[PDB]
Amino acid sequence: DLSYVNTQLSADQVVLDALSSGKADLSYVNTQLNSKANLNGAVLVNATTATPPISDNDTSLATTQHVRSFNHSRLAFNAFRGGQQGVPSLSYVTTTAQFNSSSVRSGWGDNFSSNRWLVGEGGTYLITVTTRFATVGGTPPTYFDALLFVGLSGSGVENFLTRSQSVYPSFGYTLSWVGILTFNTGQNVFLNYQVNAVGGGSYSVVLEDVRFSGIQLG
Amino acid sequence: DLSYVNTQLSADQVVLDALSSGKADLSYVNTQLNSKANLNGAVLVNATTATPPISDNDTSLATTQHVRSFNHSRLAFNAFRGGQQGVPSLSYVTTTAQFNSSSVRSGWGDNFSSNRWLVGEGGTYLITVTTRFATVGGTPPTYFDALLFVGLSGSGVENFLTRSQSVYPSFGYTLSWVGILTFNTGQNVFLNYQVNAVGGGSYSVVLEDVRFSGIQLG
Amino acid sequence: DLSYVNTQLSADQVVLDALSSGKADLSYVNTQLNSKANLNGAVLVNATTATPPISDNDTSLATTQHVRSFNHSRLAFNAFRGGQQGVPSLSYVTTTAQFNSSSVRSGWGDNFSSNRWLVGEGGTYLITVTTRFATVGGTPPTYFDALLFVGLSGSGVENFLTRSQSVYPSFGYTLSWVGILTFNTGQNVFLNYQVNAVGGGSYSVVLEDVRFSGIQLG
């Protein structure tokens, strides 16, 4: 009937008004979307995450803090001795220098203990060794010799670094070597030195200011 | 015959159709949100952002340019002397080595003026020094001694580094050293060297081709 | 006719119910958007991108892989000699030591060919050189002289680095040098050494353990 038409039409009109409120406008939705970033070619400002672990090796983003930490973490290890270390035999007898203090990059399996460099991660590395061999007490030898090498007792692989010799050991010489040396993970690496001197009497060669540190390079 | 009721029925239909036309559909929005938008925990593509300043340490995202700039900024100074310099006194007198040219990284306060380096950023640094001492004129000494240490301004600190002693300075000796040191922002650092030599006569020990460069580690 | 209105109302209802089912509903839309990543205040649990090429310098985001590679990529090159070679002339003869093995970083044009380092990329590089000159057999010369300098192909720049001298060179002297050098793109660079010895007889001079390597510092 007449009144019937009124009622049913008013009912669906109410639904139309409910749809109006419950739904989103073209312009409003477009504005909200423009507020966000497109998946491709996304551009943003003042965007930040939580820094992933330094050891992280994935496609995840790195934060400025992350690069700060990483670059500083290429130092690998560092060890030094303050004072003098005796030499047992001046006849090309391999001996391992000691270190009262040492430091190591953390989070890579590296550890320095008992004057040992644990190679936490293998790869290419840069090694810089500087020490001083000197004689104190007695007559300085008429001839001196001291080779510098990255030796390893048991394997004896002595990467020859340098051989400084001179007949004025009474005041000591400083050996300096820098070069590229590769290493494999889990290796217990230590510094070996051999000294040979002829002549003199009551003389004992002395090793001091021993610097031993590495650098990580892939 | 019904009249106004059917015309309002039809009027409602018009508004209803316009309502649908000016709205946001499910299918439409889903496509924008999934294949053409970024989520949280998203997987992204090769997009771009703004380059953060090197000075920052926040968790903002780093760009390849930022990595380049930060890794290249890890030198922080390099001083070089061209020519020659004479040794003032051969009595282990604390002598401040002088420099002709220097360069420092920007954005950290590092400075190399008056032959003294300023610590722009307090922290650990790797310092390398290469000095050359030669005897010119007179008779070569029967004893030549040169001590190298990291002089701190206002103290003449004897941070002993190297002492090369040989009695053949007739042509020239080059002393080089590399090692790790720590410093704090605001500490004025210049290379003080003590040189002593005995024997000979009317000779002149000349310091030349001095290099004093420090590369930051940590 | 009520059937008339009923069929037209059924048409209205068809549109109504279709547009109701197929539409984006506000609460759900807001939920999804909140799940999405805001462009300005972007803070995401994690996110990944294709590892951009190491050479990239745009404002594209950096990956942990990229950070590792670039630092590892900053080695520039390396050159090493295995075995011993004889020094041809002790007469200040400009001689370029040859190399048996050498590696370069990829993706920069760097190449080490003909025992000469081609500067793939211009910039500031830290150069590391280690050479040993030793006299073998017969009478060691009464004096020795060996200049170490970075000769430059095409230009003839024998950058005086260090000079190795001794009166008993029968055991070798390794005056390894380190410092900061600048180079322009495409420059072909080698290393030249001039050796002069005085006195002695029936002695052969040997060059051994030649390491030549640099790293692209800032």
Author numbering:
A (entry chain C), B (entry chain B), C (entry chain A): 245 to 462
Question: Which passages does the manuscript contain on this structure?
Answer:
A-1(L) is a Myoviridae cyanophage isolated in 1970s9 that specifically infects the model cyanobacterium Anabaena sp. PCC 7120. Using cryo-electron microscopy (cryo-EM), we solved the structure of A-1(L) tail machine, which consists of three parts: a 205-Å-long neck, a 1045-Å-long contractile tail with a complicated baseplate, and six pairs of tail fibers. The dodecameric gp2 portal, the pentadecameric gp5 and the hexameric gp7 sequentially constitute the neck of A-1(L), to which five neck fibers are attached. The long and contractile tail of A-1(L) contains 24 rings of gp10 hexamers that form the tube, surrounded by the sheath of 24 helically stacked gp9 hexamers.
Each LTF subunit contains a shoulder and an arm domain, whereas each STF subunit consists of four domains: β-ring, joint, stem and cell wall binding domain (CBD). Structural analysis showed that the arm domain of LTF and the CBD domain of STF most likely possess the binding motifs that recognize the host receptors. Using in vitro binding assays, we observed that the arm domain of LTF, but not the CBD domain of STF, binds to the cell surface of Anabaena sp. PCC 7120. In contrast, the stem-CBD domain of STF could bind to the host cell surface. Further competition binding assays showed that the arm domain of LTF and the stem-CBD domain of STF could simultaneously bind to the surface of host cells. Altogether, it suggested that the STF/gp33 and LTF/gp34 are indeed RBPs, which recognize and bind to different receptors on the host cell surface. For A-1(L), we previously found that antibodies against either STF or LTF could strongly inhibit the infection, suggesting that they might be essential for the adsorption of A-1(L) to the host cell surface.
